[PDB]
Structures are given as structure tokens and as C-alpha cells.
Design a protein around this ligand. Structure first.
Ligand SMILES: Cc1cc2nc3c(=O)[nH]c(=O)nc-3n(C[C@H](O)[C@H](O)[C@H](O)COP(=O)(O)OP(=O)(O)OC[C@H]3O[C@@H](n4cnc5c(N)ncnc54)[C@H](O)[C@@H]3O)c2cc1C
Ligand SMILES: Cc1cc2nc3c(=O)[nH]c(=O)nc-3n(C[C@H](O)[C@H](O)[C@H](O)COP(=O)(O)OP(=O)(O)OC[C@H]3O[C@@H](n4cnc5c(N)ncnc54)[C@H](O)[C@@H]3O)c2cc1C
Lengths: 971, 52, 188, 63
């Protein structure tokens, strides 16, 4: 019977797993003695010692970035038609100067061959990755390291400008000695997903024509990544994925079957496991794949679900009566999985956090796979000598499986294994693909070779004694309770002990997403100017008592608010979708942020208002500084974050000991009312917090009221100015104004930047929440050498966004807030169509929708207004004209967010030094500022400060008091 | 507030000086909340994963 | 402490977050006649320390001490391009504060003037800039009948009449309990 | 001008010579040992001695 859709607990407890794996790992002394000997011999062979990437990194003490820079330079230098020209460049140019130019041109060469084809002034300040390397090592060593990188790129990689060129280069009437690890991944566009499909199809034919005449498993293989074959390969787009991707994967499987090849679906991130298995099951199910034993997939032992995946694959094989080739690996995305679970506030990690736990699970999974022969043909991909020795021993004799390695790794290891055990098979893969796919592949590879925990890295380091490499994993763990890494907190404890972290949901776990979709689905008269005045007077009366309520009690109230928010997350998320028009991830995130604001201001509140600060002075005198509430704060909040910004501003003011009159945006009063009721229920007295709903005229009554002590405002620049003027006109006290207003946010992407990542981050920054975020990207600057590719990739990625009803899980872009907004947006679109090049204009559904638009301007000065919607403007620039870019960013007078995408630290640092922008984001998107991590808020036309969610925020809501007592009469 | 002594001659770093209402905006001169008001904050957020 | 190094923010692995504080731009520092060196220097050195350049207009009655303080700062290592002294009346003060390119105003003086500075700032279509204004007081003292009259008298005479009462902190209004009122007033 | 010396002698005198030579080549303070170690940035090798001592009272080794 066909197995049910795969669903295993995402992040179970490490200790319970270790409690089963530790005893089952036990081996008899003759078994251990054999493993020890085989492993010793494999490691000694590796230490015999041209070598590999790890050696180059080790020999020159290179960072991953520096290794990357030299390999990229090496690849460009290898593709110069005349090797003497390369030799001249290396001796005469490289290391002498033009460091940033060389780094920029060689990286641009990878997407734009024509870009790469001056006189170098002496005494050039050594900047850039290459410049800094030259300063540390000296120019001649850098030349030596580049030539080594050239040997590595030429020997260990099969590369070309196109796939046909790579395939021709890697040609052997001989059989190919290696299988193909295809470079591609993470297609951003429909065109990219087709190019990758075509490259796979081409590779299968090339490899097929040279597959030899033996039977499997003695035929070549090809590795394939689902993310390369579909441009929105994600759980929320599952419906379209099942429909579009399965036929593509099937088409390729059939072409592989016709040459009787090994066809392996690589394993990617943990959040794509379930979706990949759905795709693989539906593909495998097709009758056209009967009679062929080469179909298979990779399974990652570093994941706690690994054993369950093996059961699933085996049941799939028996249900369809197939033989499968199954690749067992540890896992290539460990750091990514840790980071993600943390950002997403998951309740645990999908992967193990101690390396020895992965090693244990790998051997346990291998044992399980060996017992599933001959239906399953196991392939153990590892370059760990101890892992190889242990799997070999468990096989007790052999055959019915193979080992796997990557060209350029474990060469001596596997040669020695083959000398010592002649009937052992091992498959060698070579990376094959286009230059445009190299960078993304290289980064991941360099992280494994540079890792201190890497077996390959250690076996090459003669400081590491052979016996240290032979420590059994079970002896490193010793006790179940030690399975989890002691220095890696769970995401709920990311900020411990300062405060608790809000909980998130993993959309890649179908049980969690379905439950969240289920819970969510299961879930106002204005005020007269008199009512608003009574609210002020009433809040004025409640001020005295609340200001004198102890800080720990005010703080306990905010913390209880956070707890009630998370307990009722489904209720508030429903409200964010219905009233705010937010997609599920945006609504969930807003809810987290609201809870985060409560907990962070609570914690900063105790620190700041919990006790007086003693001031030093003479004897016989005490001096104490305190911070007290100011009075009645008016809090004016916008529609785009109607719960979190509303609550951040209000709970801040409350925490400082102020009573508050809060006026929410006209479009979103209901979430505000529920939030207020919730704060009251959390312990905020009725007399300290009042909600007044209405338009700007009601907002204006509150701010012109002579008795208020301050205003906290988030909204339009014009409204902030009129509030400031209404306040300044008063004959009363000058009160504080905290105003966070708009931005015209730029991103600067240089030619060292990875286009697939720029595109992803640009599409996110500009079009997430239909661009209805104050931090949203409005203006992309891209260097001309990579402009065409980058714009094309951004436009292709924008086209894949689903625009529609924010309650549908598949939607990427919901509606804009109201007709007034849509109209303003459409007018700007109509204007830009007559004024600038249209690169993309998407299809809006009927209703209050604006689709992503991408325009290219001749100059930045053509964008003069913050346009509050999904509308990206693009300016291409020449590298020498960076100052004109920086000058253009200053000219707007705004300074909220800025993105920078570049490999070059000196460039990044120069940009940071120059600009005054409040939040600079480097090599990631510009949105989703996290409370207490990215204190958010800008300067100039963007705001007054201080930054929300940062440590200078609360003070502003308070006033200082010094008490000086002459104590001499007491002693 | 000065208790059982005179009300003048606030000493820098001992009595951060300055008032509220019609008396001033804050922050107090000669105290630890003064300098910040003359500055603007800047958050730099760098994705460091490609380095480790 | 504040500007010497960045503040690291906790966050996820694989990401760094640092909070820094930079100068805002050009500060206008307006100082009174009653503490013509110390308040002048306090406001000016604060703005400078924070990384701002400064245009300082001293009280019309006390420009000479201000000029000397400025020259002293230059000699102490403050670049000529970072600190400028502009002398004159209130119209000159109004010129500096109404200037669209300044990044903030630090002011010590009359409540009426502070309001007009605040109105000139808010009238601008540019950024909303900080206004730091320390203005006057009508300062009270409360003396009860447990207070030592010889000490109350001394502290009252000092608080009210030191510097001919030309201090913003000066005692203006003494409240004294009736049982001790006659003696305390007579002693003051 | 630079003069290059080669060690010349009998095997029976090698051991004593080798020991002393290996102590200089293995020393962490050795310039030759550092210049060959790519972990040591070129600028670290260029610190002026006077800047390492800074003050007379620091001339003697503290440890
Ligand atoms: C031919 C081939 C194909 C591959 N295909 C894939 C694939 O499709 N998908 C995929 O994800 N991987 C794949 N890999 C594996 C990945 O590329 C690495 O090579 C592999 O994880 C290295 O394991 P090891 O036995 O070589 O080395 P080792 O040095 O023994 O083990 C290193 C591994 O330990 C794990 N690890 C490191 N630190 C920790 C920690 N603190 N806690 C828990 N675990 C930790 C990581 O997974 C790391 O990769 C493939 C490898 C080969 C050779
Ligand atoms: C051709 C030749 C002939 C030589 N003949 C002699 C000889 O006849 N007698 C003799 O004693 N040496 C002699 N030497 C020197 C000795 O062999 C070493 O080569 C020399 O001291 C290295 O100095 P440096 O400038 O090469 O290296 P560096 O790495 O610059 O300097 C190393 C030297 O610093 C000194 N040093 C190390 N640590 C400390 C410390 N904590 N405090 C103070 N000083 C320290 C030691 O002297 C050490 O040798 C000779 C060297 C050469 C090349």
C-alpha cells in the first residue's frame, strides 16, 4: 500500500534519540579493532600527500571569502584564450593594483563573459578582498595562491559559459570516469527553471553516449535538485508544484531511464523535505519508470527525521515494486538550518547540533539501509575515513552497496580502500555546469572545506593526531543528556535570560501549517471632538496613580500582554488578514513582533525605571537620578502594522509611567480595540489607557490639546509636520515629538554580488506586503556589468508571485489597504510608464490590488516621492560613479533603510561610513526588523528618533529627576 | 530637588541639572542622558553566513 | 562610553547586528549671559563630542568670554571647520535657527525665545530636528517647623541672592510653616 | 654585498650543531619562522622594536 504523505515530527528531543542510538552503536572488540585498522590506513593514505581546496585554504590561511575570490579569479584566468596572456596578467597586474577592479571583473565574468577581457598607478592603497590578501600575504604569495586555485578549478570542476561548453570539456569511445553533480539550484525565474531542465537533459545525453556496456550499478549517475526545476519550490506553493514540477522531473527520469543511468534527486533544506518527498513519490509512481533500477534520492543523516525518511522510501519502493538507489549523506545546510529555526522561532532544530550525533545517526541509518538490500541499493557519500571504515565493517563482506565521493576529495582515502578491499565500489562525482551557477555552488562547498569540524580539513592538518580522528562518536557524546550542543540555545531561548522569544511556525512542516491554517480559519463608531477631550482629561486623571505604580508591576503587565497575544495568536492573525489584508507569514510575523515589543520594553523598563541611579559626590550628601512618567501621551499609529506598531508605541509610553490616549489608523480600528481590551485584561488600568477612533481631525484634536505631555507618531511626513506645528504653536511646555515617517529606500548591488540572492532579496524587500512597509526597497542601484542579468532575474522572480486573497496560503502579495491608496499607486504607474522603461508590470486580480511593477530610470532624481506600494525603481551605474549614487541617496533627504549587496568589505564599509541611514542591511533583505536585534528607525525626513525596539527608546517617554539630600546630620 | 541645603550650584556628574514643563525639554545637562540627544542611532545588519 | 565603540545586539547565528551613534550635522548652540563660559562650553562641547559641527551664538552681553572659549577649543584640538562663533542680537540667533541646513538646536535662555525657536523649526518643511531647551523657573522652597532656622536662613539667603539672583535655579518663592514664620523671615 | 655560510664538518660534530640550529628555527619569536607562516600578517613583522617596548620600565620581560 502506497505510504501516506510524509509527516514526521520536525524537531524531536535530541536526548531521547541519543538514548536509543548510544547502546545500538556498541561493537565487539574485534569489530572495533578492524574499524580502527581500516580507518588508520585510510587516514595515513590521505596524509601521504597537488591536492585540494582544504589544502589551499590551510596553506594560505584563507577565509572562505578569500578562497572564493581566488577561485573566481582563477576561473576567469583559465578561460582567457591564450595562457601566456594569463601569465602576463598574474605577474604584471595581479597584486600590483586594481584590486577591487580585478575582484569585480572576474566575478562579473561569471554572468557576463564580455565584461572581462588599464595602467596601474603605483602606491595604490590595497583594498578589496584581493587587496587585503596582498597586504597580509604579499603579492607574490597571492600569485602563487591564484595559480593553485587555477589548478583546482581546472582539475576538480567541469565548467563552461554554457552547459554545452562544459559538457564538451568534460568529454572522455571511452566511458566517463565520473558521475555528474550538476551545479544548478534555486531557480528564480521560469526561464531559469527551463534552462536547468535543458542542462540536465543535455547532460543525460552526453553521459548516456559514454555510459559503457555494464549493468547498474556500474553506470554513471547524474544529481538533480528540485529547487533548480521550479522557481517557487516551497510548501505554500505545493499545489502548483505538484502540477508543474512532477512532469518535468518525470521527463528527465525517463531520459535517464533510456540510458539506464543512476538518477538521483539531491536533498536540500529541511523545510523542503516533505515537499520533495511528495514530488518524488508522485514522479516515481509513473508506470513509465518500471523496469529500471537507477531512480533514487539523497537522505540526510544530520536530520532527526532521517530514519523515518528511510522507512518511507522503502515502503514507496515496495508499494510500487521498484528497486531504488538511495544516497546517504550527512548534510550540506547545517548552518542554514540553525539560523532559520532561530529566525523563525521554531520549537527546536530539525538537525542535530553536536557533530558526533550526526556521525551516530549516519552509522545507524547506514545499518538500516544495509538491511534493506537488495531492493534498496545504498550509496554512502562521505569523505570521513572513520565513517567509511565503520560502514564497511557493518557490511560484513560486501556488495549490494557503494561509496561516493566528490572529485577533489577523499582521493587517497578511496584509493587505499580499493587496494585493501578489491570488491568495494565507489562512485566519483564531478561538478558540471555553467559559470553563472558556480558562485552559489562554490560558497556552500567552501563552507564544508573550511569548517573546523570537517573530517577532510582535519585529516589534512598534521597538527591533528591520527588517533583524535578515530574517537568513536558514542565516546564523544557519552550520555544522552549531552546530545544537544550546550552552547547552542533553542530559538525560544535566543534572548535568555534578558527575555523570552515569541513562538513561530515552520511552514515546511505540513502538520504545523495545516494546524495554523485551521486555527486561523476557525476565527465601530468614530469619536466626537468632545469625546476625545474627555479621553484626555480621563487619562490625565489616571496619570498620577499609574506613574507611581512600581516599574516591576507595569512590566508584569506588558509581559502578560505578550503571553495573551501568543495564546490568542490565531485570533489576532485572523484580524491581521481580514482587516490588514496581510498574508499569513506577514500576519504571524506581526503578531510575533507585537509580543516581542511587550517583552523587550518590559525588560528595558525594569533596567531603566526599576531603581534610581546613585551619582557619586562628596561625603555627607546623597544624589540619586530617577526617571518618571511625563503625563498623557498621545499615540498615533498607521494601518500597515496595525497591531505591532500600535502596541509598541503604546506599551512603551505605558512602561515609562505615562497614561495614553491612542488613535489608530481609520482603516484598522478593530485590531486596535482588541489590543486595547487585551492590555486592560493584562493589567493596564482603564484610567491609564483610552482608545479614540476617527480621522485626522480627531487625531488633530488630541495633539492640539493643551494638557498632553508628548506625542508618539508613526505615519506620513506631512502629517508629522502638521503635528509638530500644532505642538509648537502652544504657549505651554515644549513636549517631546517622536515621529517615524517614510523613506525612499535604496539598495546598492555591485558586480561581486550573487544575482540569485540579490533577486530574491530585492523581490522580497520591494514586493512583500505589496510594498506596504516603510522599510521597503524603492530604488535599486545595480552595476552596469551585471544590470541586464540582475533586472531580468528580478523581473522573472516578480512574475512568479501569486497576487490575490491573503487568506489563501499560496498568495505572495495581498491587496493594498484601500481604493485611495490603489489610485495613488496607479497614478504613479501611469506617470512612470510615460517617463521610464517598463521592465515588468504584473497582472492584478479584480479588486483593490496593485501588482509588482519594475521601472528603470535614467537617474535617481526621477524618483521624488515615497510611493507606498509594490513598485521597484532601478538605476544602473558605472563602478567609477559610486559617488554619484551616494550623492543621489543623500539628495532625497530620507534615511530609513539601505541595502548593500557586495562581497567587498571595503566597499561595504565605505558606503556605511558615507550614509546616515538608520538601518543598513548587508547581503540580505531590508525588511522584518526584529525587536531588540535591529533597533528600527531613521533620520532626516525619515524620523526623529529614538529607534523603536532599541535601548534609547524608553528614556524619551520619561523625564529625569535628581534628588539631592544633605545627609551630614545623620553621619 | 535639594533637601536641607541650598538650591544652587549643581555639580556636573553629581547633580544632572535641568527641568520639565515650562522649565525645559530635557535631557539634563551634566548627566548621562545628555550626549545621546545630540546623536542619531545607526543599526548595521550583516548576513555573515557565507563566512561562517 | 557612548561613541567609543559599537553595541553588539543579540540575534541569530550567521548574522551580526551593531548599534552605533553618529553626529547629526550642524548644531546651533545658543547660550545665556548668566553663565557665559560654563553653559556656553557645556552645550558646545556636548554637540562636538557627539560628532556634530557647531555654530555658536553667545548672549549679546557676553561675547568676549565666548570668543576666548572658542579660541581655547580650537587650540585644544577642535578644527576651525567644526566650530564657529557668530555674535549678535536675537535676529542673528533667529537667522541661524531658521537656516534649513542645521541638524539641531541647543538653547538655554528665556521661555518666550525658546518657543519662537521651536516655531521657526516646526515651520520648516525639512526634517524635524531636536530642540534642547533649558528655560527658567519659579523655584520654591518648603520649610517646615522642624527645620533649623539658622540653616534655613543661610540656605535661603544663598539660594535667592547669590549672583544677585541671576541663576535659573535661584529660590523665588519660600513657603514657611506659620509657627516658625516670624522667626525665619526676620532671620532671612 | 652579502656573505653566505655553509656548515662544514664531520658527522661526529653534527648533533651538537643541529640541536642549536633547530632551537632557532623552531622558536616562536624567530623572524624566519614567522615570515614563513602565512597566518602572520606582513605588517605584524614590521612592528618597530621601539613600539613593542614603548617604555623603559618595560625593558625586562615581565614573566
Ligand atoms: C557525492 C555527494 C553527494 C552529496 N549530496 C548531498 C545532498 O544531496 N544534500 C545534502 O544536504 N548533502 C549532500 N552531501 C553531503 C555534503 O555535501 C557533505 O559532503 C557531507 O555532509 C560531509 O560529510 P562527511 O562524512 O564527508 O564529513 P564530516 O567532516 O564527517 O562530517 C561533516 C558533517 O557533519 C555535519 N555537522 C557539522 N557540524 C555539526 C553539528 N554541530 N551538529 C550536527 N551535525 C554537524 C554536517 O552535516 C557536515 O556536513 C553529498 C556528499 C557527497 C560526497
Ligand atoms: C653567518 C652567521 C653567523 C653567526 N655567528 C654567531 C656567533 O658566532 N655567536 C652567536 O651567539 N650567534 C651567531 N649567529 C646568530 C644566531 O645564530 C642567530 O642566527 C641569530 O641570533 C638570529 O638573529 P636574527 O636577526 O636572524 O633573527 P630574529 O628572529 O630576528 O632574532 C632572533 C634572536 O633574538 C634573540 N632573542 C630571542 N628571544 C629573546 C628574548 N626573549 N629576549 C632577548 N632576546 C631574544 C636571540 O638572540 C635570537 O637568536 C650567527 C648568525 C649568522 C647568520
Amino acid at each position: 500500500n502506497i505510504p501516506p504523505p510524509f509527516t514526521a515530527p520536525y524537531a524531536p528531543d535530541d536526548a531521547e534519540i541519543a538514548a536509543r542510538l548510544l547502546p545500538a552503536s556498541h561493537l565487539s572488540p574485534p569489530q572495533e579493532a578492524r574499524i580502527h585498522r581500516t580507518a588508520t590506513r585510510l587516514i595515513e593514505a590521505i596524509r601521504k600527500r597537488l591536492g585540494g581546496v582544504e589544502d589551499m585554504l590551510r596553506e594560505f590561511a584563507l577565509s572562505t571569502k578569500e578562497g572564493l575570490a581566488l577561485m573566481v579569479l582563477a576561473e576567469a584566468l583559465l578561460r582567457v584564450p591564450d595562457a601566456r596572456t594569463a601569465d602576463q596578467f598574474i605577474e604584471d597586474k595581479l597584486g600590483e593594483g586594481d584590486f577591487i577592479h580585478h575582484e569585480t571583473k572576474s566575478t562579473a565574468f561569471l554572468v557576463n563573459a564580455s565584461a572581462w577581457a588599464r595602467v596601474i598607478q603605483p602606491g595604490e592603497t590595497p583594498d578589496g578582498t584581493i587587496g587585503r590578501l596582498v597586504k597580509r600575504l604579499g603579492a607574490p604569495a597571492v600569485r602563487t595562491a591564484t595559480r593553485q586555485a587555477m589548478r583546482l578549478m581546472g582539475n576538480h570542476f567541469v565548467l563552461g559559459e554554457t552547459i554545452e561548453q562544459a559538457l564538451e570539456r568534460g568529454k572522455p569511445g571511452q566511458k566517463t570516469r565520473y558521475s555528474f553533480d550538476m551545479l544548478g539550484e534555486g531557480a528564480r525565474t521560469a526561464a531559469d527553471a527551463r534552462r536547468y531542465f535543458d542542462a540536465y537533459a543535455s547532460a543525460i545525453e552526453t553521459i548516456g553516449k559514454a555510459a559503457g556496456n555494464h549493468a547498474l550499478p556500474d553506470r554513471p549517475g547524474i544529481s538533480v535538485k528540485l529547487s533548480a526545476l521550479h522557481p517557487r519550490f516551497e510548501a505554500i506553493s505545493r499545489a502548483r508544484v505538484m502540477v508543474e514540477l512532477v512532469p518535468q522531473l518525470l521527463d528527465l527520469a525517463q531520459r535517464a531511464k533510456a540510458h539506464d543511468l543512476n538518477f538521483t534527486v539531491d536533498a536540500e533544506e529541511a523545510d523542503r523535505l516533505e515537499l520533495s518527498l511528495d514530488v518524488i513519490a508522485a514522479t516515481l509512481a509513473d508506470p513509465s519508470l518500471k523496469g529500471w533500477d537507477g531512480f533514487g534520492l539523497a537522505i540526510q543523516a544530520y536530520q532527526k527525521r532521517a530514519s523515518a525518511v528511510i522507512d518511507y522510501v522503502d515502503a514507496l519502493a515496495r508499494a510500487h515494486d521498484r528497486k531504488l538507489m538511495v544516497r546517504l549523506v550527512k548534510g550540506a545546510y547545517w548552518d542554514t538550518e540553525i539560523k532559520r529555526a532561530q529566525e523563525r522561532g521554531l520549537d527546536g532544530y530539525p538537525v542535530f547540533t553536536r557533530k558526533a550525533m550526526t556521525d551516530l545517526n549516519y552509522v545507524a541509518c547506514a545499518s538500516k539501509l544495509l538491511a534493506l538490500r537488495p531492493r534498496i541499493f545504498p550509496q554512502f557519500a562521505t569523505h570521513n575515513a572513520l565513517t567509511v571504515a565503520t560502514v564497511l565493517e557493518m557490511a560484513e563482506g560486501s556488495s549490494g552497496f557503494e561509496f561516493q565521493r566528490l572529485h577533489g576529495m577523499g582521493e587517497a582515502l578511496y584509493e587505499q580502500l580499493a587496494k585493501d578491499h578489491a570488491d568495494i565500489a565507489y562512485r566519483t562525482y564531478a561538478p558540471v555546469g555553467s559559470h553563472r551557477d558556480l558562485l552559489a555552488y562554490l560558497v556552500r562547498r567552501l563552507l564544508e572545506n573550511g569548517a573546523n569540524s570537517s573530517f577532510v580539513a582535519q585529516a589534512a592538518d598534521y597538527r591533528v593526531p591520527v588517533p583524535a580522528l578515530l574517537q568513536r562518536p558514542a565516546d564523544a557524546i557519552v550520555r544522552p543528556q549531552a546530545a544537544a550542543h550546550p552552547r547552542i540555545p533553542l530559538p525560544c531561548d535566543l534572548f535568555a535570560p534578558e527575555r523570552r522569544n515569541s513562538r513561530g511556525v515552520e511552514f515546511g512542516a505540513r502538520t504545523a501549517l495545516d494546524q495554523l491554517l485551521t486555527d486561523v480559519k476557525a476565527e465601530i463608531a468614530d469619536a466626537t471632538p468632545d469625546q476625545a477631550h474627555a479621553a484626555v482629561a480621563a487619562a490625565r486623571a489616571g496619570f498620577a496613580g499609574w506613574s507611581r505604580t512600581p516599574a516591576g508591576i507595569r512590566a508584569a503587565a506588558l509581559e502578560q500582554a505578550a503571553h495573551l497575544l501568543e495564546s490568542r495568536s490565531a485570533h489576532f492573525i485572523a484580524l491581521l488578514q481580514r482587516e490588514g489584508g496581510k498574508t499569513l507569514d506577514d500576519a504571524l510575523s506581526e503578531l510575533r513582533e507585537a509580543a516581542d515589543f511587550c517583552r523587550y520594553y518590559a525588560a528595558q523598563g525594569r533596567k531603566l525605571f526599576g531603581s534610581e541611579t546613585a551619582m557619586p559626590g562628596p561625603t555627607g550628601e546623597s544624589n540619586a537620578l530617577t526617571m518618571r512618567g511625563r503625563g498623557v501621551f498621545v499615540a498615533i499609529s498607521p494601518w500597515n502594522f496595525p497591531l505591532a506598531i500600535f502596541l509598541g508605541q503604546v506599551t512603551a509610553a505605558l512602561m515609562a509611567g505615562n497614561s495614553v490616549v491612542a488613535k489608530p489608523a481609520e482603516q484598522t480600528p478593530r485590531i486596535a480595540r482588541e489590543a486595547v481590551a487585551l492590555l486592560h485584561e493584562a493589567g493596564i488600568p482603564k484610567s491609564a489607557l483610552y482608545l479614540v477612533t476617527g480621522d485626522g481631525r480627531i487625531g488633530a484634536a488630541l495633539t492640539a490639546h493643551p494638557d498632553i505631555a508628548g506625542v508618539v507618531f508613526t505615519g506620513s511626513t506631512e502629517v508629522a509636520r502638521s503635528i509638530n506645528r500644532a505642538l509648537a504653536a502652544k504657549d505651554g511646555p515644549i513636549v517631546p515629538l517622536i515621529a517615524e515617517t517614510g523613506g525612499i529606500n535604496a539598495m546598492i548591488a555591485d558586480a561581486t554580488a550573487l544575482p540569485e540572492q540579490v533577486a530574491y532579496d530585492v523581490v522580497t524587500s520591494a514586493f512583500r506586503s505589496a510594498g506596504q512597509r516603510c522599510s521597503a526597497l524603492r530604488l535599486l542601484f545595480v552595476q552596469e556589468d551585471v544590470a541586464d542579468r540582475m533586472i531580468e532575474m528580478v523581473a522573472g522572480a516578480a512574475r512568479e508571485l501569486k497576487i490575490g486573497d491573503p487568506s489563501d496560503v499560496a498568495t505572495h502579495v495581498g491587496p493594498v489597504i484601500d481604493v485611495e491608496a490603489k489610485q495613488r499607486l496607479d497614478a504613479h504607474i501611469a506617470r512612470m510608464k510615460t517617463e521610464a522603461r517598463l521592465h515588468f508590470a504584473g497582472p492584478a486580480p479584480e479588486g483593490c490590488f496593485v501588482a509588482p511593477h519594475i521601472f528603470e530610470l535614467t537617474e535617481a532624481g526621477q524618483l521624488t516621492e515615497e510611493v507606498f506600494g509594490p513598485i521597484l525603481h532601478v538605476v544602473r551605474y558605472r563602478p567609477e560613479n559610486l559617488e554619484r549614487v551616494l550623492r543621489a541617496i543623500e539628495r532625497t533627504g530620507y534615511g530609513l533603510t539601505l541595502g548593500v549587496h557586495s562581497r567587498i568589505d571595503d566597499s561595504i564599509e565605505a558606503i556605511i561610513d558615507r550614509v546616515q541611514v538608520g538601518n543598513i542591511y548587508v547581503n540580505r533583505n531590508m525588511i522584518g526588523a526584529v525587536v531588540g536585534v535591529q533597533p528600527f528607525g531613521g533620520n532626516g525626513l525619515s524620523g526623529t528618533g529614538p529607534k523603536a525596539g532599541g535601548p534609547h527608546y524608553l528614556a524619551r517617554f520619561a523625564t529625569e529627576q535628581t534628588v539631592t539630600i544633605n545627609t551630614a546630620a545623620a553621619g
